[PDB]
């Protein structure tokens, strides 16, 4: 009940984890999902555990789709560990690029005001009452307006990856959120 040697080596080379950390995360992954394939409902259950005082269902669905690389409706361990690596230990640039993919719902190379608003409304639902909101950003629409004011340099209503990267790095509050390693 362990990973084959070849897979351990492969996954270690593709992530910021060590061999022992990979084998350890697999033990926990298998314990919760014995088949090794996480379903949308199971992934939903996990996110409900991160945010018990809100509704993470909509956001969890968007996240599930992004990191289901091969789009087969299941998150296998290889997809899980690589997602976890970028999201928990990646550099700022690598995290930003996965953040862009999440906001680019149709993967067409632009984030529209409507694509972003859908995600941000999911984020506000997920938080719930667990974050006091300044009045100037107490709605998804207000947050989106501020973001596109800061980042849409050509004012075409869409964000390229270049606009999203430079705009995010300009805001000290965004830089901090994307510069953590194991939550620190
Ligand atoms: C280690 C724990 C905090 C964690 C995370 C996480 O790090 N999230 C985190 C939060 C913030 C920043 C970075 C990471 C994720 C976790 C979940 C989703 C995405 C990323 C990490 C999970 C986890 C839960 C259920 C699963 F099916 C698999 C893993 N788990 C739980 C694993 C644990 O059930 C092992 C099991 O053996 C214990 C038991 O059965 O009693
Ligand atoms: C679960 C965790 C590893 C995660 C994911 C994710 O879904 N990964 C995952 C893992 C395995 C399988 C599938 C998915 C994404 C994550 C990243 C991109 C898109 C969707 C989710 C993030 C995360 C990282 C930086 C951000 F700016 C925001 C969120 N994080 C880290 C969140 C953490 O910074 C929250 C913060 O509020 C707490 C703190 O201050 O430490
Ligand atoms: Ca998959
Ligand atoms: Ca798009
Ligand atoms: Ca633009
Ligand atoms: Na590694
Ligand atoms: Na996408």
Numbering used by the authors: 6 to 189
Provide passages from the article that reported this PDB entry:
Crystallographic and biophysical data revealed that these molecules bind to the both spacious and conformationally adaptable hydrophobic crevice of NCS-1, overlapping with the D2R recognition site and thus competing with D2R for NCS-1 binding.
Crystals were obtained for full-length NCS-1 in complex with ATV and NCS-1ΔH10 in complex with AZS and VLZ (see Experimental Section). The crystal structure of NCS-1 in complex with atorvastatin revealed four independent NCS-1 molecules in the asymmetric unit. The 2Fo–Fc and Fo–Fc electron density maps showed NCS-1:ATV complexes with both 1:1 and 1:2 stoichiometries, where the drug occupied the hydrophobic crevice of the calcium sensor. NCS-1 molecules B and D contained two atorvastatin molecules: the first (ATV1) binds near the entrance of the crevice, while the second (ATV2) is positioned deeper within the cavity. In contrast, NCS-1 molecules F and H contained only one ligand (ATV1), located at the same site as in molecules B and D. Differences among the four NCS-1 molecules are limited to the ligand-binding regions, and within each pair (B/D and F/H), the protein structures are virtually identical, with RMSD values for Cα atoms of 0.151 Å (B vs D) and 0.155 Å (F vs H). Notably, in both cases, ATV1 is buried within the protein interface and shielded from solvent by an adjacent NCS-1 molecule, with F58 acting as a lid. ATV1 engages 10 NCS-1 residues in helices H2, H3, and H5, forming 355 contacts across a 423 Å2 interface. In contrast, atorvastatin and vilazodone also localize to the upper half of the crevice but extend further into the central region. These small molecules partially overlap with an inserted helix H10, suggesting that the compounds disrupt the dynamics of this critical structural element, thereby hindering its proper insertion into the binding cavity.
